[PDB]
Write a protein that holds these residues in place. Structure first.
Motif, PDB file in Angstrom:
ATOM      1  N   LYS A 118      12.355  -2.516  -4.117  1.00  0.00           N
ATOM      2  CA  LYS A 118      11.266  -3.060  -5.034  1.00  0.00           C
ATOM      3  C   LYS A 118      10.093  -3.692  -4.213  1.00  0.00           C
ATOM      4  O   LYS A 118       9.049  -3.462  -5.072  1.00  0.00           O
ATOM      5  CB  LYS A 118      11.738  -4.196  -5.757  1.00  0.00           C
ATOM      6  CG  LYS A 118      12.791  -3.775  -7.071  1.00  0.00           C
ATOM      7  CD  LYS A 118      13.281  -5.031  -7.828  1.00  0.00           C
ATOM      8  CE  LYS A 118      14.509  -4.799  -8.833  1.00  0.00           C
ATOM      9  NZ  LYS A 118      15.604  -4.312  -7.766  1.00  0.00           N
ATOM     10  N   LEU A 119      10.073  -3.896  -2.939  1.00  0.00           N
ATOM     11  CA  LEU A 119       9.059  -4.176  -2.353  1.00  0.00           C
ATOM     12  C   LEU A 119       8.176  -2.897  -1.996  1.00  0.00           C
ATOM     13  O   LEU A 119       7.050  -2.880  -1.901  1.00  0.00           O
ATOM     14  CB  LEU A 119       9.287  -4.976  -1.016  1.00  0.00           C
ATOM     15  CG  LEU A 119       7.916  -5.226  -0.232  1.00  0.00           C
ATOM     16  CD1 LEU A 119       7.142  -6.318  -0.901  1.00  0.00           C
ATOM     17  CD2 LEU A 119       8.392  -5.493   1.229  1.00  0.00           C
ATOM     18  N   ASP A 174       6.021  -1.874  -4.574  1.00  0.00           N
ATOM     19  CA  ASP A 174       5.163  -2.681  -4.818  1.00  0.00           C
ATOM     20  C   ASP A 174       3.968  -2.455  -3.475  1.00  0.00           C
ATOM     21  O   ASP A 174       2.661  -2.419  -3.922  1.00  0.00           O
ATOM     22  CB  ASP A 174       5.255  -4.156  -4.663  1.00  0.00           C
ATOM     23  CG  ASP A 174       4.298  -5.241  -5.316  1.00  0.00           C
ATOM     24  OD1 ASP A 174       3.580  -4.550  -5.876  1.00  0.00           O
ATOM     25  OD2 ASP A 174       4.498  -6.253  -5.013  1.00  0.00           O
ATOM     26  N   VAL A 175       4.428  -1.872  -2.433  1.00  0.00           N
ATOM     27  CA  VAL A 175       3.080  -1.892  -1.505  1.00  0.00           C
ATOM     28  C   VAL A 175       2.921  -0.394  -1.483  1.00  0.00           C
ATOM     29  O   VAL A 175       1.716  -0.081  -1.243  1.00  0.00           O
ATOM     30  CB  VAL A 175       3.759  -2.098   0.022  1.00  0.00           C
ATOM     31  CG1 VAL A 175       3.054  -1.844   1.123  1.00  0.00           C
ATOM     32  CG2 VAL A 175       4.514  -3.609  -0.107  1.00  0.00           C
ATOM     33  N   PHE A 179       0.349  -0.216  -3.975  1.00  0.00           N
ATOM     34  CA  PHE A 179      -0.851  -0.871  -3.539  1.00  0.00           C
ATOM     35  C   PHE A 179      -1.614   0.043  -2.682  1.00  0.00           C
ATOM     36  O   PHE A 179      -2.931   0.186  -2.654  1.00  0.00           O
ATOM     37  CB  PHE A 179      -0.772  -2.004  -2.987  1.00  0.00           C
ATOM     38  CG  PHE A 179      -1.612  -2.722  -1.883  1.00  0.00           C
ATOM     39  CD1 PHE A 179      -2.722  -3.214  -2.570  1.00  0.00           C
ATOM     40  CD2 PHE A 179      -1.536  -2.991  -0.675  1.00  0.00           C
ATOM     41  CE1 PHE A 179      -3.676  -4.093  -1.974  1.00  0.00           C
ATOM     42  CE2 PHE A 179      -2.518  -3.189   0.235  1.00  0.00           C
ATOM     43  CZ  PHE A 179      -3.631  -3.973  -0.402  1.00  0.00           C
ATOM     44  N   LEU A 180      -0.936   0.648  -1.548  1.00  0.00           N
ATOM     45  CA  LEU A 180      -1.707   1.520  -0.525  1.00  0.00           C
ATOM     46  C   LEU A 180      -2.174   2.816  -1.004  1.00  0.00           C
ATOM     47  O   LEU A 180      -2.869   3.626  -0.303  1.00  0.00           O
ATOM     48  CB  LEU A 180      -0.819   1.850   0.651  1.00  0.00           C
ATOM     49  CG  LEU A 180      -0.403   0.518   1.494  1.00  0.00           C
ATOM     50  CD1 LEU A 180       0.568   0.773   2.562  1.00  0.00           C
ATOM     51  CD2 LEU A 180      -1.594  -0.247   2.013  1.00  0.00           C
ATOM     52  N   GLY A 198      -5.760   3.594  -0.665  1.00  0.00           N
ATOM     53  CA  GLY A 198      -6.114   4.676   0.432  1.00  0.00           C
ATOM     54  C   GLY A 198      -6.676   5.678  -0.347  1.00  0.00           C
ATOM     55  O   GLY A 198      -7.430   6.710   0.278  1.00  0.00           O
ATOM     56  N   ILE A 201     -10.523   4.834  -0.214  1.00  0.00           N
ATOM     57  CA  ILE A 201     -11.080   4.708   1.290  1.00  0.00           C
ATOM     58  C   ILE A 201     -11.451   6.220   1.750  1.00  0.00           C
ATOM     59  O   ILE A 201     -12.430   6.677   2.048  1.00  0.00           O
ATOM     60  CB  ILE A 201     -10.312   4.082   2.216  1.00  0.00           C
ATOM     61  CG1 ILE A 201     -10.269   2.356   1.869  1.00  0.00           C
ATOM     62  CG2 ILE A 201     -10.517   4.619   3.666  1.00  0.00           C
ATOM     63  CD1 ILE A 201      -9.443   1.654   2.910  1.00  0.00           C
TER      64      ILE A 201
END
Ligand SMILES: [Zn+2]
Ligand SMILES: [Zn+2]
Lengths: 51, 73, 51, 320, 472, 30
Positions: free
Chosen positions: A3-4, A7-8, A11-12, A16, A19
């Motif tokens: 689950k992390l 979440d990451v 986010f990235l 990303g 950017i």
RNA sequence: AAAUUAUAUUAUAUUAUAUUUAUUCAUAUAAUUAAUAGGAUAAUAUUUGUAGUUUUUGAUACCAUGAUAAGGAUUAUAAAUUGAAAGUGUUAAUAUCAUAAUCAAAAUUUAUUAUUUAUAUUAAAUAUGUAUGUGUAGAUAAAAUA
């Protein structure tokens, strides 16, 4: 951790993409036209003997 | 790409990779009076730097026109 | 470096009892100086196993 | 403990006491629930042709005991001082014994006695679903009912905080709710009796059935209303917190007077020595052994003999 | 043990004292008075030179170059009225030529009053210099610049007397004088700044004057001060398409200043990243000035979508400041070539977001954390914001249970422990033993102990049931 | 008392303490 | 006198009879106390044998625990599956030191003619007559005198 990693990765992905879009808007300006750096031109003409 | 660039004919430019580990604790060793030596232990345990270079990238011409790495090299 | 800064600050909003470490494999230019490290002949008196 | 006003917060002696008592934590650790490990089973303490006394010792981390009287004829059981961290063994015991729980006797309403009372009533009524359980208590303990939440604050009993006590609900002694004309699980509890402080040997009893009478005795000092049970046919004195093995109850809690405890110990001298006294905490004894070997009663009667008009006895360290 | 918070940051010192802020304000006031004193001394010297050349040289006619230098020094110090009879006399004597008119029009933009307005009035904001130089007689200096432009075009038509119908409009002097006119009209009020790409550019086109790169850069800077970004980006796209080897850094400075004025800071970041990518034309300290001021303007911007529920959100953009400064160390832009106000904000954001390795080994000691707590407890009324107050795309009918053998691999230890008496009529469904359903570490022993206790109390209950029902 | 492991392990509330309290640097050593 | 519950597999043992050793035991011993203190890239405190002295190591009891053995019932009407296996109740005997005023057994370390069980050493003897255990062990892949 599963689950992390959802979440990451979400986010990235949004960070990303923002950017790379900031780099893609610069690369498409560098392809429309620009002036050659004299230090970049001096780097190509640096060797004594060429091929 | 960071790194110095050599323009003299006695300086060859090698495009190389560098691998390293960053590790900072955030659960228990984030802060207290132990945090210094634990962070130093994490840093010295992650002291490895892996420097990698393809031999095909070394087979270019030098500043003197001769190839940098030939077959016998 | 804008992405590396944003990647390092994931450690401040991680999950409960869940930590992380970072790996980075980047390209970096290396100069082999042929004057500091010259390519010379072998010496007249060669080295042995006693050295 | 108490309410943190302006004077308690600007006091350095308060922080000094909270450092001395609890070390670097400063907060008192509560009294937790006993886990399912290190928990013993229900023991049958006494068997008689009339009644059966079944009990369990150290059922709290207050080190209290849980007792139930069973009428052999009417199949009716009676819990006294209903405070057990696991009232699931008791409901299974009642259901496997084919018993009916009709009342719960309460000596006094301290937290070591009424902590799991709603759990007892809810689980036993849920088993009765497959007439509700009444509560027998003294109204002076009303002043200890209202501080059930505060006592649940200090001893860490957070899950029993937001619970309306069944002694606070509307009984037959109270006015009734005027509900809108367009429910009775909590609005009215008809099975509720309020014990009177005028306790005598004539009519201050509960008809348990089969000619067994349970005389409740008003004996303050540990509480404003403290009711012992006395069964003279069985020689059994449920003392609660008045008398223990080689010690008596505390007076260093609020609404506790030492001279009331001394009068409560003095109203106990007409019972025979073979009366087994059964305390709320610890091991059981006899009243003759407490007349011979208890130093608090020796000090009480010695102060009475040397001429103290206000004899004040009581413990300051012991059981709540 | 009580758990520590992992989403609470380490207590570290990021701030200054009241005394240090007062001394910074005092030193900046002293520097402003020093710049004002320097400009007043230079202006007094220029006026004394004018009074000397007007009093002592009453009838002796001066050489024309002394009067030209005096008119230039008068117009540079913001004294335009004391210089225009000198220019009228020099034009009437036909002593002025192609470069002298452009020199006079460039001096009419007052680049000595601009330094005082920069260091004292505008507080070193370079857009605010253009905004504040329009107050010191913008319309009158604009009218004088238009009059001197007409004088210059008349003298250029005189000095050019084949290409005969295409003179002097095809010469370099007409383009130089038009660039000087645009550079002077930028200094004036908003009307002339708006008229630079509107009236002046159309007049330069209708006259047939070929522009240069400074013409497009001044038109881009006028559109930047107007706040019109699509036209300025269109002009730089025209320059990127056709004349790309002539682009200098002033166009990038125009776009940075304009996107700072239009408050589109993402475009400022895009322009700065593009300038770091191409590395040519070289970044001046004005580039770093405009970009860091855009960063400080975006970081001090309050937001209204979270409605300041916890804290200010944009302060995290000051974390971009230790990155870009390092880029300056790669770009060869010296960080000491920044203004004192911007250097104060950059050191503020650096002490808020920067640490070294040697401090990172010592910043979490309990002594410093408890000193932070004690300093918040003692005097937090001085520093607190609140105390001021398969593949799915080819899947459509999913194949289930495809004979993948789970008995070749080994997963045998799938044992589970259920509570005793799930369907027992004597054991109640609701109970505190439901709390035994959430326990993982000692699960097996707790389930066995609960089952043994329930079996013992059910056996004792049925034994007492049999004894009581058989005793009566 | 604790957080269960089958619960989602999200961050409960963010803490902005260094941006609410800006502390000047103060060490005991000169 | 049937059904088989039965585990079954193989090996060992002693003062022959004396000697060295791993542990055990004897008698000689060393070890003792308390509390913090931030240092490069930080807008200026020079600083740390300083604030501590009568500092903490001090309640092993007669509670109602829990283990042991023993008997009960339910499901297979399929030849498919890698795999036709799983849940639910009663009596005897044994047993029960936690609301109180302390202290180093093997808290615990080290050594000496001496006490063992084990460690390996360890032999003569045909004149006659001769020398049967309980157990300790490892993984576990035969079966009908009641
Ligand atoms: Zn009580
Ligand atoms: Zn009690």
């Amino acid at each position: 951790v599963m689950k992390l990693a959802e979440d990451v990765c979400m986010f990235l992905k949004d960070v990303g993409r923002q950017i790379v879009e900031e780099k893609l808007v610069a690369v498409r300006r560098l392809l429309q036209g620009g002036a050659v750096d004299p230090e970049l031109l001096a780097a190509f003409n640096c060797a004594r003997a060429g091929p | 790409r960071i790194g110095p660039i050599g323009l003299e004919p006695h300086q060859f430019n090698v495009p190389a990779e560098l691998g390293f580990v960053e590790q900072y604790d955030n659960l228990q060793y984030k802060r207290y009076d132990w945090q210094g030596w634990y962070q130093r232990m994490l840093d010295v345990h992650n002291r490895n730097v892996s420097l990698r270079c393809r031999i095909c990238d070394l087979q270019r011409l030098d500043g003197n026109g001769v190839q940098f790495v030939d077959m016998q090299t | 470096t804008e992405f590396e800064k944003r990647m390092y600050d994931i450690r401040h909003w991680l999950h409960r009892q869940t930590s992380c470490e970072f790996h980075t494999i980047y390209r970096r230019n290396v100069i082999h100086d042929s004057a500091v490290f010259p390519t010379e002949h072998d010496p007249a008196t060669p080295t042995t196993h006693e050295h | 403990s108490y309410t943190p006003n302006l004077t308690s917060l600007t006091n350095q002696v308060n922080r000094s006491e909270r450092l001395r008592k609890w070390g670097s934590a400063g907060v008192p650790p509560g009294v937790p629930r006993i886990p399912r490990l290190e928990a013993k089973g229900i023991a049958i303490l006494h068997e008689s042709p009339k009644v059966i006394l079944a009990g369990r010792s150290r059922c709290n981390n207050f080190d209290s005991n849980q007792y139930m009287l069973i009428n052999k004829a009417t199949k009716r059981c009676l819990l006294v001082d209903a405070s057990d961290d696991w009232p699931d063994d008791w409901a299974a015991f009642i259901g496997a014994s084919d018993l009916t729980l009709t009342h719960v006797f309460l000596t006094h309403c301290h937290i070591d006695n009424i902590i799991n009372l709603n759990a007892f009533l809810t689980i036993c009524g849920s088993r009765q679903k497959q007439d509700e359980i009444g509560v027998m208590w003294c109204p002076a303990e009303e002043c200890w009912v209202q501080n059930f939440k505060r006592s649940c604050e200090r001893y860490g009993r957070f899950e029993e905080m937001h619970q309306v006590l069944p002694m606070m609900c509307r009984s037959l002694y109270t006015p009734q709710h005027l509900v809108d004309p367009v429910r009775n699980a909590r609005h009215l509890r008809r099975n509720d009796v309020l014990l009177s402080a005028a306790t005598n040997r004539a009519t201050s009893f509960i008809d348990f059935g089969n000619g067994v009478l349970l005389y409740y005795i008003f004996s303050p000092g540990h509480s404003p209303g403290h009711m012992m049970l006395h069964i003279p046919t069985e020689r059994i004195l449920f003392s609660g917190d008045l008398l223990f093995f080689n010690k008596v109850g505390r007076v260093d809690l609020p609404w506790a007077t030492g001279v009331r405890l001394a009068e409560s110990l003095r109203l106990l001298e007409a019972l025979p020595d073979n009366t087994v006294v059964v305390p709320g905490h610890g091991r059981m004894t006899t009243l003759g052994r407490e007349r011979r070997e208890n130093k608090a009663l020796q000090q009480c009667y010695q102060r009475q003999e040397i001429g103290k008009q206000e004899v004040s006895v009581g413990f300051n360290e012991g059981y709540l | 043990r009580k758990p520590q918070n992992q989403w609470e940051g380490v207590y570290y010192y990021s701030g200054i004292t009241k005394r240090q802020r007062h001394l910074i304000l005092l030193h900046r006031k002293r520097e402003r008075e020093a710049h004002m004193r320097s400009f007043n001394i230079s202006r007094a010297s220029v006026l004394q030179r004018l009074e000397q050349l007007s009093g002592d040289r009453k009838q002796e006619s001066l050489p024309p170059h002394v009067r030209l230098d005096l008119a230039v020094r008068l117009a540079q110090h913001g004294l335009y009225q004391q210089a225009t009879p000198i220019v009228d006399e020099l034009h009437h004597q036909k002593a002025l030529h192609a470069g002298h008119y452009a020199l006079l029009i460039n001096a009419l933009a007052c680049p000595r009053l601009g330094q005082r307005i920069l260091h004292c009035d505008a507080q070193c904001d370079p857009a605010l210099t253009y905004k504040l130089l329009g107050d010191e007689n913008g319309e009158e200096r604009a009218q004088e610049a238009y009059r001197w432009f007409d004088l210059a075009l008349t003298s250029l038509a005189v000095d050019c007397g084949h290409f005969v119908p295409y003179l002097p409009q095809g010469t370099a002097a007409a383009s130089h004088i038009t660039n000087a006119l645009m550079r002077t009209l930028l200094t004036c009020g908003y009307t002339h700044v708006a008229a630079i790409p509107d009236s002046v550019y159309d007049r330069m086109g209708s006259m047939g004057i070929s522009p240069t790169i400074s013409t497009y850069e001044l038109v881009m800077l006028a559109l930047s001060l107007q706040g019109n970004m699509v036209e300025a980006e269109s002009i730089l796209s025209f320059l990127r398409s056709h004349h790309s080897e002539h682009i200098t850094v002033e166009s990038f400075n125009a776009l940075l200043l304009g996107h700072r004025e239009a408050r589109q800071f993402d475009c400022c970041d895009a322009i700065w990243q593009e300038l770091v990518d191409r590395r040519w034309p070289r970044a001046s300290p004005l580039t770093a000035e405009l970009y860091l001021r855009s960063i400080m303007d975006h970081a001090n911007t309050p937001t209204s979508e979270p409605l300041q529920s916890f804290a200010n959100i944009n302060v995290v953009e000051k974390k971009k400041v230790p990155l870009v400064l390092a880029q300056m160390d790669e770009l060869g832009v010296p960080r000491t070539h920044l203004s004192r106000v911007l250097m104060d904000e950059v050191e503020d954001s650096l002490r808020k977001f920067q640490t070294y390795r040697s401090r990172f080994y010592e910043w979490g000691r309990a002594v410093k954390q408890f000193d932070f707590i004690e300093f918040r407890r003692r005097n937090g009324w001085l520093y607190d914001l609140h105390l001021m107050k398969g593949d799915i795309y080819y899947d459509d009918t999913r194949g289930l249970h495809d004979r993948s053998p789970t008995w070749m691999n080994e997963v045998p230890e799938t044992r589970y422990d259920r509570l005793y008496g799930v369907n027992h009529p004597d054991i109640a469904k609701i109970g505190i033993r439901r709390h035994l359903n959430v326990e993982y570490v000692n699960r097996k022993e707790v389930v066995e102990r609960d089952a043994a206790l329930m079996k013992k109390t059910l056996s004792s209950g049925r034994r007492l049931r049999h004894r009581v029902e058989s005793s009566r | 008392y604790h957080w269960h492991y089958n619960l989602p392990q999200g961050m409960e509330r963010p803490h902005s303490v260094n941006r609410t309290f800006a502390a000047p640097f103060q060490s005991n050593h000169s």
